[PDB]
Design a protein around this ligand. Structure first.
Ligand SMILES: [Au+]
Ligand SMILES: [Au+]
Ligand SMILES: [Au+]
Ligand SMILES: [Au+]
Ligand SMILES: [Au+]
Ligand SMILES: [Au+]
Ligand SMILES: [Au+]
Ligand SMILES: [Au+]
Ligand SMILES: [Au+]
Ligand SMILES: [Au+]
Ligand SMILES: [Au+]
Ligand SMILES: [Au+]
Ligand SMILES: [Au+]
Ligand SMILES: [Au+]
Ligand SMILES: [Au+]
Ligand SMILES: [Au+]
Ligand SMILES: [Au+]
Ligand SMILES: [Au+]
Ligand SMILES: [Au+]
Ligand SMILES: [Au+]
Ligand SMILES: [Au+]
Ligand SMILES: [Au+]
Ligand SMILES: [Au+]
Ligand SMILES: [Au+]
Ligand SMILES: [Au+]
Ligand SMILES: [Au+]
Ligand SMILES: [Au+]
Ligand SMILES: [Au+]
Ligand SMILES: [Au+]
Ligand SMILES: [Au+]
Ligand SMILES: [Au+]
Ligand SMILES: [Au+]
Ligand SMILES: [Au+]
Ligand SMILES: [Au+]
Ligand SMILES: [Au+]
Ligand SMILES: [Au+]
Ligand SMILES: [Au+]
Ligand SMILES: [Au+]
Ligand SMILES: [Au+]
Ligand SMILES: [Au+]
Ligand SMILES: [Au+]
Ligand SMILES: [Au+]
Lengths: 173, 173, 173, 173, 173, 173
């Protein structure tokens, strides 16, 4: 077994595979979120685009992790992908709340894997997470908090109007 | 009678002529809708443009149908065009409601003609409807549903403000 | 009722609505004329283009009139559009004869409306007709007379050949 | 036998091979028609070009059919190509009459194959015919009817002059 | 429930959701196939690219289906995604064998859904499958059969050399 | 009979018509050869392109001959086109063997016609063959011999690998 593998614990290999599952789960969640906002009875295009873009980003993170797994001589192993936690996601506010919960879980998974890499003395893993994941997550979580604050401000009284305005003037489409 | 006509039933020929009447009726309805929104006491320019654009699209569909009638060796026959169902169209919401009702009737007419073509074993007619009409109608009806949802969200409380905002931030002009 | 309306009689308002009906009728007549010449058993493409172009021009005149109706604070009211006077239009000669009869009726309607505007002391209406309609009609009627003369010259003896030649060498396609 | 073949009946496979023969026959007919009009004692260049262009179109249709046969896992089988029905094709009128008869036979073959695909529940075949053949045939047959009408109009009295004029002013070269 | 929904059976809606699951499953299978060929102990880059490209194509098909679901007024419902059938995919030959089996299953699912649309008289669904899926699948399955034949020819005697050569001279990277 | 014909024997006229049949036969043979190599169970794209290109070249030669027939005042006469000698063409080697046999027969037909032109003292015919056919055939036959030699060298031991390599590194696609 691997001719290239060096300083790459079975523990980190397994944890990388679990993280791939988590990122692909998050991608699937964002696919569901995106298409919910494209429903004719929800129709918030900018919200749809925001979530579909994140579906792509999460999928990219999984592919980054799989490439890394191979560069270290580990073996990608895929598991069932569980469906998203909801079939309908409520208002933009509800949806952003669910998204920041999801991001925080990914973030905690990254931190846990960092702490494993540190215990296993694996500086290439630590560097890899710092280079492509930790700051990325921090920036996204901040953006989502900014959004939540703006949504929140808009939707006390006149909830519908606030939702429309946030979609039109903050979100991209 | 026609040197080119082949596999083209008198039933489909008549039904094509009726569909032309329906599309020209819808065009006239959208002309009336467009100019209502240009009234100084209504003054929603983006709404006016949205309906005038559809008047053009419906007229184009009628001309497509007439060209097809001729390519198959059928004979265009024109009937009186009935005036639109209303002289005043109310709010943007009322107007979009009336437009989606109209589109659904055109859609049902297309489906009925498809079902006739299928019973008459006329695959060129079926192809023609699929190529230029069925998806076009589906996309338009979806857009209108999206609009209705957004209008609806805006006009619970503060009806005037919501109407202005929808016109300014969703509709084109 | 209208905050903008000034010096705009109910008589001119009604007459503008009737003129809109006439122009849309003429547009429909030219649509029928155009597609007749596209029949495989008539097949005079340049004739078809000449009439379809006029269908567009007449529709534009109606839209000009409706825009004016709104700029003056009048209220567009639409009536049933009667179908064209014939289902088949004969030869190019027959068709041009029918077209110049139609244009003369539009012209007389314009003159009558001018005479109303003059009796109502409505110089904006008079200016509007002079700017966009009266000369336009005069030029078109002259063109049609030129055509009739050329068609007429061609179709004494050898009627078919003359018809083909006029279509090929005078009409555009 | 084929690793790719799926939902592709032996009946449709055979019928596709027969259609290839028909299209290559039609191509050969148009080659003969083209070169007849290039004879120094016929010399109607535009007619020659019109038929040679159709020879190419028919050959292209056969190649489209053969490519499809292969994409479905069927087996192209070629038969003898029968020579065209005439060695001399008469006037432009005679020739256009013969061409529209030929096109109608191809059209009927396409319809028959459509009806077979429908009975065999082969929606890829149906789509393939709709995409590349049915409308193409309808447009060509209409063009030919237009031509026949114009030729017919020209060649009552002064047959030679009419023939020259049609070739010069309608046909391309 | 939906203001836009018209002629859209609950049966087709459910079947569209199942097809989305199948396409996302196939995408996941191709992700696993792609990264297997990127393993340092397999190292066939062109094979990896071929499968990763198909992972993207299958994901795109699912998104096309979800967009359609929304345009018709149906409701996207997501299920668990089962992991791919194998963790290791053997040789290029083994892998292409598995891929054509997968494609044929997608193809059969498309055909079944076509047959449902036909039984439900849903011509927009039928058109949608013809426009974006049926020919696409046919072309891909043909390409894969071509590949299988070439792989097969190369890997009787000198299996390693044949595998390298196919990757270098047929597959893209 | 012909006003232009000069120094053009009935013998050469007939022989030109036979040569046209031969060239169109060869074109049909190459069409069959081309599509055989496009079969999913043969799949040698470069071989397919090589033969389809020759189908076009042979057809061009027939059209050159027909144009010449007309320029001399002869009369093109078309006969039945016999189907190709095989339905399946074996390996690339088998196919190239069959192609060089065919070319040699065309070449011998050209030589025979040259010898007829010489006996009939027809220097325009001789020039015509020298200008457009004799060298063309010589170059093609040489190319095919080169190919046969290279195929032959490759397919002693490891027949499949040799076939793939010849297609990839010598033939165009
Ligand atoms: Au979305
Ligand atoms: Au979106
Ligand atoms: Au998007
Ligand atoms: Au770390
Ligand atoms: Au570390
Ligand atoms: Au990165
Ligand atoms: Au954002
Ligand atoms: Au308007
Ligand atoms: Au407007
Ligand atoms: Au507009
Ligand atoms: Au249909
Ligand atoms: Au049909
Ligand atoms: Au269209
Ligand atoms: Au819109
Ligand atoms: Au026209
Ligand atoms: Au026209
Ligand atoms: Au036109
Ligand atoms: Au006046
Ligand atoms: Au006046
Ligand atoms: Au004007
Ligand atoms: Au003119
Ligand atoms: Au020709
Ligand atoms: Au020619
Ligand atoms: Au030509
Ligand atoms: Au069919
Ligand atoms: Au079918
Ligand atoms: Au095509
Ligand atoms: Au033409
Ligand atoms: Au890959
Ligand atoms: Au790759
Ligand atoms: Au790739
Ligand atoms: Au279907
Ligand atoms: Au259907
Ligand atoms: Au597509
Ligand atoms: Au490929
Ligand atoms: Au080929
Ligand atoms: Au090829
Ligand atoms: Au080719
Ligand atoms: Au000679
Ligand atoms: Au000679
Ligand atoms: Au030459
Ligand atoms: Au070559």
């Amino acid at each position: 077994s691997s001719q290239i593998r060096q300083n790459y614990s079975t523990e980190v290999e397994a944890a990388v595979n679990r993280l791939v599952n988590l990122y692909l789960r998050a991608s699937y969640t964002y696919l569901s979120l995106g298409f919910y906002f494209d429903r004719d009875d929800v129709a918030l295009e900018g919200v749809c685009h925001f979530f579909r873009e994140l579906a792509e980003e999460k999928r990219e993170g999984a592919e980054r992790l799989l490439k890394m797994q191979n560069q270290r001589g580990g073996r990608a192993l895929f598991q069932d992908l569980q469906k998203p936690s909801q079939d309908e996601w409520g208002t933009t506010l509800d949806a952003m709340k669910a998204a920041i919960v999801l991001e925080k879980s990914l973030n905690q998974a990254l931190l846990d894997l960092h702490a494993l890499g540190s215990a296993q003395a694996d500086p290439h893993l630590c560097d890899f997470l710092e280079s492509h994941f930790l700051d990325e997550e921090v920036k996204l979580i901040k953006k989502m908090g900014d959004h939540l604050t703006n949504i929140q401000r808009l939707v006390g009284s006149q909830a519908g109007l606030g939702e429309y305005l946030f979609e039109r003037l903050t979100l991209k489409h």
